[PDB]
Amino acid sequence: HHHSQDPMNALTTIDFNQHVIVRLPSKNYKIVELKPNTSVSLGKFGAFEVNDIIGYPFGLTFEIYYDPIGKVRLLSKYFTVEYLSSSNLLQFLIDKGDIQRVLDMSQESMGMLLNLANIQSEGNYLCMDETGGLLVYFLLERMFGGDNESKSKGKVIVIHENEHANLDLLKFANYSEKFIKEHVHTISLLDFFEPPTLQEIQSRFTPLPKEEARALKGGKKNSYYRKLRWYNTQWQILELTGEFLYDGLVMATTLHLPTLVPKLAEKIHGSRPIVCYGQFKETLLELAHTLYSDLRFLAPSILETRCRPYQSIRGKLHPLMTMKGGGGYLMWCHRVIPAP
């Protein structure tokens, strides 16, 4: 940067140009981008100046007051500013009514998925995500904690149904485009299962010697590197689809699992976890019986986790009277290697 002073830590501190969470007095969430010298409207609850909240820690509640844009002070109406965690993104999507878009998943089910899958900073994980990238976001946050400068080398490889992946939720994530291209690889089902051969690729392009390519300039240099980026995309597919074995498989898709999971598991190393999320238990039941017949899978189990919060007021403790149903199910098992 161009300031002599140390920058603000966006993981601990409200900072310019970050997407952050705002909790309203009605307790629903909003996502707000903090562009400098702009104002933010909370409708009924007033409006405020972005500049006036920068530099504070997350977790604070601010009061908007007037002497229409108001002034802010710490609450002695109001709002609370939070980091945009994987949990808060999920809650925001539920508040705005997108519960079917996220396949009815809950914080506790996704929390359990992360640990059943043994997700770690250095692992290379195979992933299907039909949610617009919410599952990929849970992974990345657990692996890297929002840290664009992380030295860890873990990767999420996303296999997807259409020509391009839908990972739009990552637009909220505060990861740089460089970080994302280094830790997230996308590849279609077709490229993954029927990849191009090297011969096929080279017969459309073979690089110039790098001395010659370096000496290119003008439109010829741009013309060539555009072909070279296509070449590298194809090369990456070769790397991802060869005899490369992955460290785990996590899935949140509504494709037919019994006919899909065994094919995906061919690329998973022995002893690694497989976790399939499903909104409906019957779906996973069918999968589990299928996997029972296949000795490459150890003891498939259907798990359920449900959270019930309490009204947490001293002298009036009881669980919440009503709440949302659902939250889905996990199928957990381990890839194993049968004996001859």
Binding site: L11, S85, E122, R142, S271, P300, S301, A339, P340
Partner: protein, 324 residues
């Protein structure tokens, strides 16, 4: 940590988890001259060493085991069944709600059997773990050491945290390695988990060791609701906010089949009685897939009380001005 990373081949000296059955998972250190025994047969280590992790191992009159790389989930399943430990439904929820990551600096008391410890250590920047009981402390220290947790990101300290707080100073009984000019650890915790009989006695000591410039998250783990009540009282007195208690309920289902028995077949048997005046999945019969709850459920583990604190509730005013 032998829990961390991803091993390819089983090597002599490796700690493995040998899966015998769903309720029988044994920690076994590979040694070429040793033999692993099961109620179904004996499995020589020399016939395991050198094979890929995840290998099914077979012996004749066939019997089987699977040899797996240690994992916190699997390790937790391998511990003595009736014990006082945190299971994956609770701990995975706690880690997710407190947003655990390499950014996390955690304080855990007490260590107990180290079930939660291993799950923390996999994910977290550093773990500071405290144990009151000196025999338990020594066992956890030896085990964390053997597992490689101590030489990675875990510190354990022999301490009564309710009486003596959480500071780690040179001279204390601890595994902490002090750096140059370091006479005390700087814990700077942004995540706190208390599993203690009286967490309300430990909460006052946290102000000396938590981070001062970021949101700090706390979870207290208590079996009885009067314990929750005492915790809510003291959290409020010491300035903890956004306080909420929840319970987590986990269930597991078996995949089973029920025989399909038609009316027509029951009628035909009645008609024949009138004239005179199986193993599940058997292909001679029709079957319907069904889910069957585990025979025994964990209908309560503990109440989980969450709370948050920011110490320095302020900003650098003209550092924000100095950006324009």
């Amino acid at each position: 940590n032998c829990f961390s990373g991803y091993k390819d081949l089983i090597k002599e000296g490796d700690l493995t988890l040998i899966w015998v059955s769903r309720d029988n998972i044994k920690p076994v250190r590979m040694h070429s001259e040793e033999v692993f025994n099961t109620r179904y047969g004996s499995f020589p280590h020399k016939d395991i060493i050198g094979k890929p992790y995840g290998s099914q191992i077979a012996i004749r009159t066939f019997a089987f085991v699977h040899v797996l790389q240690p994992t916190p989930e699997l390790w937790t399943l391998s511990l003595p069944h009736r014990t006082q430990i945190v299971y994956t439904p609770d701990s995975s929820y706690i880690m997710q709600r407190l947003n655990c990551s390499p950014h996390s600096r955690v304080i855990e008391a007490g260590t107990g059997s180290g079930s939660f410890s291993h799950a923390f250590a996999r994910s977290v920047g550093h773990l500071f773990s405290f144990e009151f009981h000196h025999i338990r402390y020594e066992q956890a220290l030896e085990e964390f050491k053997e597992h490689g947790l101590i030489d990675d990101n875990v510190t354990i300290t022999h301490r009564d945290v309710c009486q003596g707080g959480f500071l780690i100073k040179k001279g204390d009984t601890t595994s902490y390695e002090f750096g140059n000019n370091e006479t005390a650890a700087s814990l700077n915790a942004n995540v706190v988990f208390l599993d203690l009989p009286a967490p309300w006695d430990a909460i006052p000591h946290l102000d000396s060791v938590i981070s001062v410039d970021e949101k700090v998250g706390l979870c207290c783990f208590s079996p009885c609701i009067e314990q929750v009540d005492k915790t809510l009282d003291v959290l409020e007195k010491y300035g903890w906010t956004d306080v909420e208690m929840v319970e987590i309920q986990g269930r597991q289902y078996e995949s089973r089949r029920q025989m399909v028995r038609s009316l027509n077949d029951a009628l035909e048997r009645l008609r024949d009685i009138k004239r005179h005046k199986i193993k599940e999945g058997d292909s001679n019969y029709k079957w319907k897939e069904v889910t069957k709850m585990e025979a025994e459920i964990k209908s309560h583990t503990s109440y989980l009380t969450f709370a948050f604190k920011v110490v320095n509730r302020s900003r650098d005013d003209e550092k924000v001005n100095e950006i324009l």
